[PDB]
From Swiss-Prot, chain A:
Residues represented out of the complete protein: 325 to 553 of 695
Native organism: Homo sapiens
Biological function: Pore-forming subunit of the voltage-gated potassium (Kv) channel involved in the regulation of sensory cells excitability in the cochlea. KCNQ4/Kv7.4 channel is composed of 4 pore-forming subunits assembled as tetramers. Promotes the outflow of potassium ions in the repolarization phase of action potential which plays a role in regulating membrane potential of excitable cells. The channel conducts a slowly activating and deactivating current. Current often shows some inward rectification at positive potentials.
Name under which the protein is recorded: Potassium voltage-gated channel subfamily KQT member 4
Binding site for a 1,2-diacyl-sn-glycero-3-phospho-(1D-myo-inositol-4,5-bisphosphate) 2: H9, K12
Taxonomic superkingdom: Eukaryota
Domain commentary: Each channel subunit contains six transmembrane segments (S1-S6) with S1-S4 forming one voltage sensing domain (VSD) and S5-S6 contributing to form one quarter of an interlocking pore-forming domain (PD). The CALM binding domains correspond to the first two membrane-proximal helical regions that interact with a single calmodulin/CALM molecule forming a clamp-like structure. CALM N-terminus binds to the second helix in both calcium-free and calcium-bound forms and regulates channel trafficking. CALM C-terminus binds to the first helice in calcium-free form; this interaction is disrupted by calcium binding which regulates channel electrophysiological activity.
Disease per UniProt entry: Deafness, autosomal dominant, 2A: A form of non-syndromic sensorineural hearing loss. Sensorineural deafness results from damage to the neural receptors of the inner ear, the nerve pathways to the brain, or the area of the brain that receives sound information.
Swiss-Prot record, chain B:
Residues with N6-methyllysine modification: K113
PANTHER family linked to this entry: CALMODULIN LIKE 3, MYOSIN LIGHT CHAIN 1, 3
Listed name of the protein: Calmodulin-1
PROSITE patterns: EF_HAND_1 (PS00018), EF_HAND_2 (PS50222)
Family annotation (SUPFAM superfamilies): EF-hand
Species this chain originates from: Homo sapiens
Length: 78, 145
């Protein structure tokens, strides 16, 4: 209530957000990279994506679900 | 706004999970497909992922919920605002920027840490001028199409 111990408390009310904030960015970037990363720019993935395009779509569906969980846990720190 | 065929693409992906063909994706089927790809999610992680799209409450994902999720991705208004709020957590100036080094430092040291090649692909996807500051907002505009 009195002075500084809030400024060192407001640091900690906010510090518990930095891990869920990073998780949200990392989950969002990994979702965005699903359709642009060099990891999929190989002959193996092009052929794999030709015979079975469902595999890459399944990987995207999993990453979307992980992004949604991460976005929630970050919102629960507000 | 979805073509009849890109709906059939999502139906093909849905059917990979829904092996028994009963129209629902349980934690069993979701985790089985995840672990055939080499991932190891906990049972609680499977429930949290399913609960994000389970609009009925029976603990399963049906096809209408599935294609809605697949069509939305991160393009919704709530995602754009929350992802940026996560970037602002590491923004001391309040400028809308963050130094390319601190972004690299945050991505490789907090949460599900990115590999050296992952964060290098992220920094390459953003553009940097002058001091070394990324405009992380036009970055979340790029991620959220
Ligand atoms: Ca089923």
């Amino acid at each position: 209530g009195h002075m500084k111990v809030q400024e060192q408390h407001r640091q900690k009310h906010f510090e518990k957000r930095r891990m869920p904030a990073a998780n949200l960015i990392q989950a969002a970037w990994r979702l965005y990279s699903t359709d642009m990363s060099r990891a999929y720019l190989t002959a193996t993935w092009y052929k794999l994506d030709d015979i079975m395009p469902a595999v890459k779509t399944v990987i995207r569906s999993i990453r979307i679900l992980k992004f949604l969980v991460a976005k929630r846990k970050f919102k629960e720190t507000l | 706004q979805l073509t009849e065929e890109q709906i059939a693409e999502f139906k093909e992906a849905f059917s990979l999970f829904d092996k028994d063909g009963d129209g629902t994706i349980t934690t069993k089927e979701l985790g089985t497909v995840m672990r055939s790809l080499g991932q190891n999610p906990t049972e609680a992680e499977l429930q949290d992922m399913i609960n994000e799209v389970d609009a009925d409450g029976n603990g399963t994902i049906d096809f209408p919920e599935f294609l809605t999720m697949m069509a939305r991705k991160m393009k919704d208004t709530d995602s754009e605002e929350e992802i940026r709020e996560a970037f602002r957590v590491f923004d001391k100036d309040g400028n809308g920027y963050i130094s390319a080094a601190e972004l690299r430092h945050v991505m490789t040291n907090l949460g599900e840490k990115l590999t050296d090649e992952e964060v290098d692909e992220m920094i390459r996807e953003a553009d940097i001028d002058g001091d070394g500051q990324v405009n992380y907002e036009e970055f979340v505009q790029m991620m959220t199409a």
